[PDB]
């Protein structure tokens, strides 16, 4: 939930 907010898919 640091990064992945990101990556997100």
Same mark, same amino acid.
């Given at each position: @939930? +640091? @990064? $992945?907010?990101? +990556? $997100?898919?």
């Amino acid at each position: @939930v +640091l @990064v $992945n907010e990101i +990556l $997100n898919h």
